[PDB]
Amino acid sequence: GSSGSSGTSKQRYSGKVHLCVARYSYNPFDGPNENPEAELPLTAGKYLYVYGDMDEDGFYEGELLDGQRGLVPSNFVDFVQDNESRLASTSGPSSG
């Protein structure tokens, strides 16, 4: 896997994946949502793997550690990082 290059969201079910950490325990099957299965029950602290990027609706196809595949709000997920420190860094941030 991991081809690289990148260009544009090709497929939201094969492309690179991102690891996020539920920012706030969420449950789609807690409301009248007629499509709770679509989403995923985020658990503050827990992590998930969202393949691709934002969806047409504006959700993340996070893949629960259990294998649960569904939508995921970026407002309830925090793109966690294993070990940021990777490169020696060449460029810095900008003001703003």
Swiss-Prot record:
SH3 domain mapped to chain residues: 15-82
Transmembrane region(s): none
Cell location: Cell membrane; Synapse
Subunit structure: Interacts with RIMS1, RIMS2, CACNA1D and CACNA1B, and potentially with other Ca(2+) channel alpha-1 isoforms.
Role played: Plays a role in the synaptic transmission as bifunctional linker that interacts simultaneously with RIMS1, RIMS2, CACNA1D and CACNA1B.
UniProt domain comment: The SH3 domains mediate binding to a proline-rich motif in RIMS1, RIMS2, CACNA1D and CACNA1B.
Family that this chain belongs to: Belongs to the RIMBP family.
Full protein name: RIMS-binding protein 2
